[PDB]
Amino acid sequence: STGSATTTPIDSLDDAYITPVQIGTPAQTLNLDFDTGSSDLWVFSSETTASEVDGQTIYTPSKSTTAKLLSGATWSISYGDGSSSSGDVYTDTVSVGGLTVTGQAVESAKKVSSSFTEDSTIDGLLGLAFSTLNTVSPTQQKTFFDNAKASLDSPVFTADLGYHAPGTYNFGFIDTTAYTGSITYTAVSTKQGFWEWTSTGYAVGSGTFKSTSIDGIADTGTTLLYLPATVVSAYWAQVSGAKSSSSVGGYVFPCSATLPSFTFGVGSARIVIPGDYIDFGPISTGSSSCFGGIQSSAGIGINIFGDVALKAAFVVFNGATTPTLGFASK
Numbered sequence: 001s002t003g004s005a006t007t008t009p010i011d012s013l014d015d016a017y018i019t020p021v022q023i024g025t026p027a028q029t030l031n032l033d034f035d036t037g038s039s040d041l042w043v044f045s046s047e048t049t050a051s052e053v054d055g056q057t058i059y060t061p062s063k064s065t066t067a068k069l070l071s072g073a074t075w076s077i078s079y080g081d082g083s084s085s086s087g088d089v090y091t092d093t094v095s096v097g098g099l100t101v102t103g104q105a106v107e108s109a110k111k112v113s114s115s116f117t118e119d120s121t122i123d124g125l126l127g128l129a130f131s132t133l134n135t136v137s138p139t140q141q142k143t144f145f146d147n148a149k150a151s152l153d154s155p156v157f158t159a160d161l162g163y164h165a166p167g168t169y170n171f172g173f174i175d176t177t178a179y180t181g182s183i184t185y186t187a188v189s190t191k192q193g194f195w196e197w198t199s200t201g202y203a204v205g206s207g208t209f210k211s212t213s214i215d216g217i218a219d220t221g222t223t224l225l226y227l228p229a230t231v232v233s234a235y236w237a238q239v240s241g242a243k244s245s246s247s248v249g250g251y252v253f254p255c256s257a258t259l260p261s262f263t264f265g266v267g268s269a270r271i272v273i274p275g276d277y278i279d280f281g282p283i284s285t286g287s288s289s290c291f292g293g294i295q296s297s298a299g300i301g302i303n304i305f306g307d308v309a310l311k312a313a314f315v316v317f318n319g320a321t322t323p324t325l326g327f328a329s330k
Contacts, residue, residue, distance in 0.1 A: 001151045002172035003099025007034065007161065010121040013280055014307060015223050017161060018121060019169055022095040023106055024064030030057050030123035034169055035221030036159070036195055036317065037304075039133035039143050040077050041094070042085055042107035043124035044116075052112050055120030061108065067092045075107045075135045080222065080300065085112040089136055094144060096126075099171050101148050105134075105141035125221070128157065128317065133193035145171070145319060155319045159220055160330070161311035163277055179314035179328035184269035188323045192302075194219070195317060197325050199305075200267060202227075204235050205260030209270070216303030218310060218317070218325055224280070225262075225273070226297035226304040235262055235294050242292070248283050251292040255282060262294060264309060266327040273312040 007017040018031040023043065030043055044053060046060040061067035067090045076086035087110035094104040109124070116122065127134070131142045149155045152172035160178050161167040168178070189196045194217040203209040214227065232251065236242040238260050242253035253259070259275030278293035293308040316326030 001099055001148070002153055002170065003095075003097035003148075004168060004170045005097030006166050007169050008166045009162065009164065010119070012164070014161075014164060014311065016122065017167070017220070017307070018123075019096070019126070021126060023059050024061070024092050025066040026064075027095070028057075028059055028064065030059060031121065032124045032126040033122050033221060034126050034128055034159075035219070036128045037217060037219035037221045038077065038079065038125065039127040039129045039131055039193065040075060040107050040135055041105065041124070041126045041144055042075065042077070042087070042109055044112070045087070045108040047087060048109045049111055052117045054117050057123045059106065059108065059124075061090045061092065061106075064092055066102075067106075070105065070136075070139075073105075073136050073139060073141075075137070077135045080304075081115070083113045083115040085109045085116060087111065089141070096144065096171065097169070099148055099152075101144055104144060104147055105136060107136065128220070129195065130190050130193045132190070148172075149319055157317050157319070159310060159315045159317065161220070161307055163274075163311050167311070174316060179330045181329055183314070183316055183326040183328040184266045185316070185318070185324045185326045186266050188325050190323060192217075194302075195323070195325055200265030202231055202265065203263040203270075204238050205275075207238075209263065209265070211265075214264075214303055216297075216305050218305050218315060220307065220310060222304045222306030223308070224304075224306050225278075225294045225308040226300055226306065227294065228303065229296045229298045232294055232296045235260070236292065244296075248289070248291070250295045252283060252289045253292055255288045255290040257290070264305075269327065271309070271313045271327055271329060273309060277308055277312060
């Protein structure tokens with residue numbers, strides 16, 4: 001089997017991407033944030049505290065003939081940005097782009113933090129990291145991908161995120177028309193539960209490539225590119241007037257600037273992030289200070305190849321017995 005679904009930016013900045021997902025019988029379609037940095041499929045639901053729902057579409061398990069309470073199971077998750085959610089668990093039929101999993105754990109939110117409430121466009125998350133990170137207790141549950149894997153034509157999914165445009169998540173096949181040149185594959189460590197890999201270095205603009213190992217995760221659920229302070233300082237030093245602002249919470253730059261590109265290494269290959277991808281616009285409406293899309297990972301504890309980086313590539317998440325990651329230009 002295979003599946004193919006379009007993923008759409010939630011706003012003009014590509015802050016996140018939503019992908020329609022069919023849950024239950026008859027289908028209830030919710031728009032979920034596919035997140036290769038976590039491993040829970042959770043949704044706004046008929047059980048979510050009413051004051052914490054503001055415009056989201058909810059899953060109502062009582063209206064699904066295939067929903068079953070997973071008795072005794074609870075979940076609770078905290079994300080890197082400080083947001084969180086928790087609740088109980090149902091199993092139900094879940095389909096993405098024509099690919100159907102029966103008996104999928106659908107984590108029903110009883111509580112969500114304010115950032116989720118305030119984002120009316122995201123009806124939940126669909127985790128695509130390794131199932132060892134799944135938070136369901138006392139019986140850990142498998143991700144949608146883990147459940148689908150054996151049925152897939154090939155045990156892979158791909159992320160093809162758009163810049164200010166829709167893109168695609170495919171399951172079970174590699175669309176050889178969706179990228180240019182060849183795909184370069186690189187080793188993955190699953191020790192922390194993430195799609196963790198080591199970039200071979202970077203360049204700023206037309207500058208020379210610096211060969212240096214940068215361990216980080218491929219995370220579709222993180223907006224920006226978070227790299228070591230040395231790398232980030234080297235980038236922003238090429239933008240006149242750019243500075244790190246503790247009050248704003250990162251590097252800012254004059255909105256009048258033209259940003260240089262940023263290149264990262266995948267083995268001997270190179271992925272170029274155009275300068276425009278690094279512009280996250282005014283810090284507040286009407287400001288001439290703009291927020292940067294490359295930020296320091298210092299104090300996160302991990303480097304994160306978020307959407308800013310991934311949307312410059314066609315990315316293969318290879319879930320073979322020994323997982324790997326592939327990157328191509330597009």
